[PDB]
C-alpha cells in the first residue's frame, strides 16, 4: 500500500484539480446503461421510476502514470470526490436522482476512469397502455448540463441497453431498450449539443 | 488545462469573493423560466408541483479577464460554489425546492455569468376548476430574499415563459404562462419580483 | 465592492467568532411571525403543518463598525453561516423544520442583525372541530433550546402575528393569531407562544 | 465574551478531544426520557412513532476548569460537535431518528455535560389492543452501540419517564411509562429499556 | 485518556489513510447479517423492506500497535470516518439504504476492525405468495461495488443468518434465512442473503 499511497499523493496533492474540458482540450465520455428494474409507474402524475447503473468512462492525461515508477500498480479505486467527474444529467427527471451505490471510481494508468453510479430516477413518462400486449414507450435524454459537444463528446459502445441484470420478477417486462447518441444545433450557437436518448418499451408482466 | 487552471486560480484564490451588491454598486439579474411539466396537483392542500429551468444572468467586473493572458480562453464552467450567486427565491413555496441539475455556472471573460438551475417546486395554488376547459390560474413570485430593488434589480427579456420544452404528455395542458417584473412598495425602498403566472387544465 | 470586502474581512477574518451569550453578557432576541399558510392538517396523528416567516433580531457589539471607515457602508447582507445565530426552536414540532429561504442575514453598522428564515413546521395540534364555525385552537412555543433567560431574553414587538401575507385561498382561514412572551420553568426559560385559532374556509 | 473565548480556546484548542472511554477509564452516562407524544401508530407495519426529549449527562476531567481563571464563568453552551458525545441508540428503530432540537450542549466547570436531544423515533411495536381499555404495551431499548458496560455504564435518576410535557390532546393516552436499566450477559451489556403502555384517547 | 489520545494521534495524524486494497495487497472482509424485522412489503412495486445489522470485519497492518507502548490499550472505538471501510453494497436496492446506528467501529491492536452498521433496506422482491402457507422467498446479493475478488475477498462465519434478535411481533415469520458466498466469473464475489418468509 506504500506505492499506492505515493501514487495518490503525486496524482492529487501536487497540482490543482483538473478544471474540466474546454474547446481546446475536449473530452469524450462514453455512456452506457444497465437497466435493473422499472420499479414504479404513476399514472396520476405521469412519472415512472427506473433503477439502473450508468457506466461512465473518460480519459485524462493528468491521471496517467508509469506503473514501473509505482510498484507495477496499473489501476486503483478512489472516491469520486478526489477527481473531476462529468455532469451527466437526465433532462426530464422530476425528482433528484437517488444514489444507490458508493461514489467510487476506478482509475487506470493510462488515465482512463470508469465510474458506475447506481441510480433511481423518476422521469416524465405517460404509462398509458402499459397494461397491453404492445406496451408503452417512454424516453429520457441524458447529457452534460453545461458543456456543449465541443467540450464533451458523448458516445455509447452500443445502442442496446444491457438487460442481463433486469429483475426477473419486476412488475414490468422490457420489450426493448436502446441508448442512442443524438446531435442537435440551436440557432443561436454554432456548437453541436449531444445527448444519449434512453428509450424503453415496456408492459406489465 | 494549464491556462484554465491559471485563470481559475487568479480569479478565485487571490482576493475575497464578490460580497454581493449594495445600494451604491447595484446588480441587475435577468431571469427567464422554461416550464417543463406541471407534475402534480393536490386539491386537498392547495399545493401544485412544477418542474422548470430557471435561467439567471448577471455580470461582475471581478470576474473579467483578458483572454490573451490566458491562452485565449473566453469562458469556462465552474461549480456554483466558486462564485457569488443571487438569492432568488420563490415567495410562496410549501417545500424546499428540489434541485434537478448540476450546480455549475458558465463564466465569460467579460464578467457575465449564466446559471441555469433545474428545479421542482411545490407552491401555494388552488387547483379548483383545473378539470374545466377554462382551467385554473395560479401564480408564484420570485425575487431576492434579502436584497431590495436598491441592490438587486430584476428583469426579464420577455414576459412569455418558454414552453417549447413543455412535456406534451403531461397530465396538464398549459393555456398561458407569463413571467412579469413587478415593483412593490411596503411601509421606503422598492422591492422587485418576477411573477410566474401559469394558467392550465387537465389535458 | 472594495469597501464591503474590507469590512467583511475585518469583521470575520480578523477575529474569533462570537461564542454566544452568557449571564454577564446576555442577549435579547426579538421574534415576530408572519403566517403564510396552514397547509395541511392530519386528524389521524394530530399534526398540523404551518408555513411562515420568522423574523429574528438581536444586536452584537462585535458586529459594529464606523461607516466612515468603510465608504459609508451602513449595512450589508451575509450568509447566516458567517455569524452567530440564536437557537430558537419550536418546542412541540413532530418533524425537523424545513427551510424555505436562503440562510442570509442583514447586518447593520450598530451591530444589529435581522434574520428572517421562512419555514414549514409540522407540530402537535388536534384539529378536531376545525370543520365547525367555532374552529379550533392550537399553540406551539418557540424559544432557545439551551439558553435560559439569564443568557437569552426573548421579546415580541407586538402580540399580533402578521397576517397580511396569509394565503387567500388556503383551505384554512385564520380566526386569530397571537405571539406572546412567556416565562416557564433551575433558571427561568423564555418562550414566545404562537397561538392560532383557525377553521376550514 | 472575552473570557468565554479564552476558556473555549483553552479547552478545545490545546489537546485532542476526549477519545471516549476504555475498560480502564470507564464513563457513566445518565439517561432520562421526557415523552412528548405518541404521534403515529401503524398497525399494517407494526411501527410506532414517538417524540421525546432524551436527557444525557456525563462528566469529564478534561472539561474541568477553575472559574477563577476565566472571569468566574461556571458553565457555557457549545456545539455538540466541539465535544465527545456518547453513541446512545435505540436498538429497534425502523427509521433513522429525526433530530428536532439544535445540536448544542451545556458544559459546567466541574466537567459535567448536559445534552438534551429532542427526537422523533419510529420503532418496532405491535399496536394491537390500542383501541381497547386495556391498551397495549410497547418497548424499545436504548444503549451505546459500540461500548460495552466496561466502557460505558448507563444509569437513570429515576425509572419513571417524565410525562409532565406529554401532549394532552395526543391521539394516545399514556397508561404508564418507565425507563429501566438492564444488564445483559465475560463483558456486561447495559441498556435502558423504555416501556410505554398506552391506548387511544 | 492520555494513552489513547497518543495512540489515535500516532495512528491517524502521521501517515496518509490506508488507500484501500489492490491485487498485490488484497483484503478479506467477513460479513454476517442479523435480521431484525421484515418491516414492509409492497406488492404494487415488488419492494420489500428489511431492518438488519450487518457485521463487517477486516484487518489492516496499518492499524496495528504494540499495547505495551500505549498503556496496555488493546482496542478502542472510533468514528468510521477516521478509517477506511469497505464499500459493501446491496446489488438490488431500490432506495438508498438508511443507516440506523452510529457510524463508529472497534479497532483492535492486531489491526482488526469490526463495524456493524444497522440498516433499513428496500430491495427487489415479489411477495406474491407471502400470505400463503408456503410463504415466499426473496434474495439480495451484497458485495463490493468497485473491487473484484482480487482486491476484496468476502467470507462469512456461517451460512445461517442470525435470527436470535428477530422481532417476535413482526407481521412476518421467518421460515429460513441464509447468507451464502457466491463466486461469479477476475472472480467477482458476493454474499447472497436469501430469506423465506410468510405472514404471521
Automatic annotation (TrEMBL), chains C, D:
Residues that bind Mg(2+) 3: 75, 187
Keyword Manganese: no
One Pfam family of this chain: Neur_chan_LBD
Metal-binding in keyword set: yes
UniProt-annotated binding residues for Mg(2+) 4: 148, 151
Cystine crosslinks: 125-138
GO molecular function: extracellular ligand-gated monoatomic ion channel activity; identical protein binding; metal ion binding; transmembrane signaling receptor activity
Domain Neurotransmitter-gated ion-channel ligand-binding: 16-199
Binding of Mg(2+) 5, residues: 151, 187
Name of the protein this chain belongs to: Soluble acetylcholine receptor
